[PDB]
Amino acid sequence: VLLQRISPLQIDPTIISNTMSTVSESTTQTLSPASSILGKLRPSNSDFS
Amino acid sequence: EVLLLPIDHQPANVTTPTLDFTNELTNWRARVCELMKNLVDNQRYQPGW
């Protein structure tokens, strides 16, 4: 909590979702690596502490 | 008795204008699209597609 006020960087909320739109797939597939990422990791600012 | 232009001037031959592909800005648009063709020709610069 003391380094919280000192450190300049905060989380950028949209790096992960602004990525994975450069690459895509056919909708015919049932597996999705990008939604696998967004179901796997949840940023939520509770990661940060 | 002179004005200065950023692009090249050339007077028209006829008074009924019609389409041609022989001028400086079409040559420019052509060279830009030729670079983008050379950029899409490699798949290192876009590995996802």
PDB file of C-alpha atoms in Angstrom:
ATOM      1  CA  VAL A   1       0.000   0.000   0.000  1.00  0.00           C
ATOM      2  CA  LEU A   2       2.985   2.316   0.504  1.00  0.00           C
ATOM      3  CA  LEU A   3       4.428   1.571  -2.951  1.00  0.00           C
ATOM      4  CA  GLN A   4       0.923   2.041  -4.394  1.00  0.00           C
ATOM      5  CA  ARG A   5       1.254   5.827  -4.177  1.00  0.00           C
ATOM      6  CA  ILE A   6       4.910   5.974  -5.231  1.00  0.00           C
ATOM      7  CA  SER A   7       4.807   3.896  -8.405  1.00  0.00           C
ATOM      8  CA  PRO A   8       3.781   5.776 -11.573  1.00  0.00           C
ATOM      9  CA  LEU A   9       2.324   2.915 -13.603  1.00  0.00           C
ATOM     10  CA  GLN A  10      -1.312   1.918 -13.350  1.00  0.00           C
ATOM     11  CA  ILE A  11      -2.928  -0.900 -15.289  1.00  0.00           C
ATOM     12  CA  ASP A  12      -4.045  -0.171 -18.810  1.00  0.00           C
ATOM     13  CA  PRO A  13      -7.564  -1.648 -18.845  1.00  0.00           C
ATOM     14  CA  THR A  14      -7.753  -2.497 -22.562  1.00  0.00           C
ATOM     15  CA  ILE A  15      -4.369  -3.826 -23.800  1.00  0.00           C
ATOM     16  CA  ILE A  16      -5.526  -7.463 -23.740  1.00  0.00           C
ATOM     17  CA  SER A  17      -8.827  -6.858 -25.525  1.00  0.00           C
ATOM     18  CA  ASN A  18      -7.320  -4.396 -27.996  1.00  0.00           C
ATOM     19  CA  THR A  19      -5.007  -7.267 -28.832  1.00  0.00           C
ATOM     20  CA  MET A  20      -6.321 -10.573 -30.278  1.00  0.00           C
ATOM     21  CA  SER A  21      -8.281  -8.569 -32.867  1.00  0.00           C
ATOM     22  CA  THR A  22      -5.271  -8.472 -35.181  1.00  0.00           C
ATOM     23  CA  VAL A  23      -5.517 -12.263 -35.506  1.00  0.00           C
ATOM     24  CA  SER A  24      -8.830 -14.076 -35.919  1.00  0.00           C
ATOM     25  CA  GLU A  25     -10.359 -17.373 -36.990  1.00  0.00           C
ATOM     26  CA  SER A  26     -13.302 -18.907 -38.764  1.00  0.00           C
ATOM     27  CA  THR A  27     -16.542 -18.891 -36.774  1.00  0.00           C
ATOM     28  CA  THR A  28     -17.053 -22.525 -37.902  1.00  0.00           C
ATOM     29  CA  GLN A  29     -14.595 -23.672 -35.226  1.00  0.00           C
ATOM     30  CA  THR A  30     -15.861 -24.266 -31.696  1.00  0.00           C
ATOM     31  CA  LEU A  31     -12.528 -23.485 -29.993  1.00  0.00           C
ATOM     32  CA  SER A  32     -11.362 -19.898 -29.492  1.00  0.00           C
ATOM     33  CA  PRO A  33      -7.905 -18.913 -28.168  1.00  0.00           C
ATOM     34  CA  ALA A  34      -8.860 -15.264 -27.570  1.00  0.00           C
ATOM     35  CA  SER A  35     -11.898 -16.062 -25.448  1.00  0.00           C
ATOM     36  CA  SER A  36      -9.771 -18.770 -23.817  1.00  0.00           C
ATOM     37  CA  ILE A  37      -7.464 -15.913 -22.752  1.00  0.00           C
ATOM     38  CA  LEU A  38     -10.326 -13.744 -21.540  1.00  0.00           C
ATOM     39  CA  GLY A  39     -11.805 -16.628 -19.556  1.00  0.00           C
ATOM     40  CA  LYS A  40      -8.421 -17.676 -18.255  1.00  0.00           C
ATOM     41  CA  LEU A  41      -7.066 -14.361 -16.949  1.00  0.00           C
ATOM     42  CA  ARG A  42      -9.306 -11.805 -15.225  1.00  0.00           C
ATOM     43  CA  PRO A  43      -7.608  -8.414 -14.586  1.00  0.00           C
ATOM     44  CA  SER A  44     -10.090  -6.814 -12.136  1.00  0.00           C
ATOM     45  CA  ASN A  45      -7.441  -4.657 -10.267  1.00  0.00           C
ATOM     46  CA  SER A  46      -7.250  -7.345  -7.559  1.00  0.00           C
ATOM     47  CA  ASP A  47      -4.287  -8.707  -9.511  1.00  0.00           C
ATOM     48  CA  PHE A  48      -2.500  -5.446  -8.883  1.00  0.00           C
ATOM     49  CA  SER A  49      -2.065  -5.527  -5.108  1.00  0.00           C
TER      50      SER A  49
ATOM     51  CA  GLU B   1       3.001  37.833 -61.491  1.00  0.00           C
ATOM     52  CA  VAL B   2       3.468  34.289 -60.152  1.00  0.00           C
ATOM     53  CA  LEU B   3       1.793  31.949 -57.668  1.00  0.00           C
ATOM     54  CA  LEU B   4       3.427  28.896 -56.114  1.00  0.00           C
ATOM     55  CA  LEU B   5       1.779  25.484 -55.898  1.00  0.00           C
ATOM     56  CA  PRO B   6       2.734  22.300 -54.018  1.00  0.00           C
ATOM     57  CA  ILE B   7       1.721  20.024 -56.910  1.00  0.00           C
ATOM     58  CA  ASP B   8       2.565  20.213 -60.603  1.00  0.00           C
ATOM     59  CA  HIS B   9       0.285  22.144 -62.930  1.00  0.00           C
ATOM     60  CA  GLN B  10      -0.334  21.243 -66.562  1.00  0.00           C
ATOM     61  CA  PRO B  11      -3.067  22.862 -68.691  1.00  0.00           C
ATOM     62  CA  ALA B  12      -5.806  20.714 -70.157  1.00  0.00           C
ATOM     63  CA  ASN B  13      -5.989  20.013 -73.874  1.00  0.00           C
ATOM     64  CA  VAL B  14      -9.768  19.776 -74.304  1.00  0.00           C
ATOM     65  CA  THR B  15     -12.783  21.529 -72.818  1.00  0.00           C
ATOM     66  CA  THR B  16     -14.814  18.319 -72.434  1.00  0.00           C
ATOM     67  CA  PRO B  17     -12.951  16.562 -69.609  1.00  0.00           C
ATOM     68  CA  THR B  18     -12.883  12.795 -69.327  1.00  0.00           C
ATOM     69  CA  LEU B  19     -11.093  10.221 -67.236  1.00  0.00           C
ATOM     70  CA  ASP B  20      -7.411   9.363 -67.528  1.00  0.00           C
ATOM     71  CA  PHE B  21      -4.828   7.635 -65.337  1.00  0.00           C
ATOM     72  CA  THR B  22      -1.834   9.788 -66.317  1.00  0.00           C
ATOM     73  CA  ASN B  23      -0.991  12.239 -63.544  1.00  0.00           C
ATOM     74  CA  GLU B  24       1.032  12.762 -60.417  1.00  0.00           C
ATOM     75  CA  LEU B  25      -1.491  11.849 -57.723  1.00  0.00           C
ATOM     76  CA  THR B  26      -2.606   8.636 -59.438  1.00  0.00           C
ATOM     77  CA  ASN B  27       1.084   7.728 -59.731  1.00  0.00           C
ATOM     78  CA  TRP B  28       1.369   8.470 -56.004  1.00  0.00           C
ATOM     79  CA  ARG B  29      -1.636   6.318 -55.071  1.00  0.00           C
ATOM     80  CA  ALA B  30      -0.189   3.579 -57.277  1.00  0.00           C
ATOM     81  CA  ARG B  31       3.198   3.629 -55.517  1.00  0.00           C
ATOM     82  CA  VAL B  32       1.553   3.555 -52.071  1.00  0.00           C
ATOM     83  CA  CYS B  33      -0.543   0.552 -53.090  1.00  0.00           C
ATOM     84  CA  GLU B  34       2.575  -1.122 -54.536  1.00  0.00           C
ATOM     85  CA  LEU B  35       4.299  -0.824 -51.156  1.00  0.00           C
ATOM     86  CA  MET B  36       1.230  -2.295 -49.441  1.00  0.00           C
ATOM     87  CA  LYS B  37       1.298  -5.189 -51.913  1.00  0.00           C
ATOM     88  CA  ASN B  38       4.976  -5.731 -51.067  1.00  0.00           C
ATOM     89  CA  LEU B  39       4.033  -5.604 -47.376  1.00  0.00           C
ATOM     90  CA  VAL B  40       1.243  -8.163 -47.688  1.00  0.00           C
ATOM     91  CA  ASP B  41       3.507 -10.394 -49.831  1.00  0.00           C
ATOM     92  CA  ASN B  42       5.476 -11.330 -46.729  1.00  0.00           C
ATOM     93  CA  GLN B  43       3.652 -13.109 -43.930  1.00  0.00           C
ATOM     94  CA  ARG B  44       6.367 -12.323 -41.391  1.00  0.00           C
ATOM     95  CA  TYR B  45       4.956  -8.801 -41.076  1.00  0.00           C
ATOM     96  CA  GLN B  46       1.557 -10.347 -40.303  1.00  0.00           C
ATOM     97  CA  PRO B  47       1.872 -13.910 -38.960  1.00  0.00           C
ATOM     98  CA  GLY B  48      -1.759 -14.217 -37.903  1.00  0.00           C
ATOM     99  CA  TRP B  49      -3.586 -14.162 -41.207  1.00  0.00           C
TER     100      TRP B  49
END
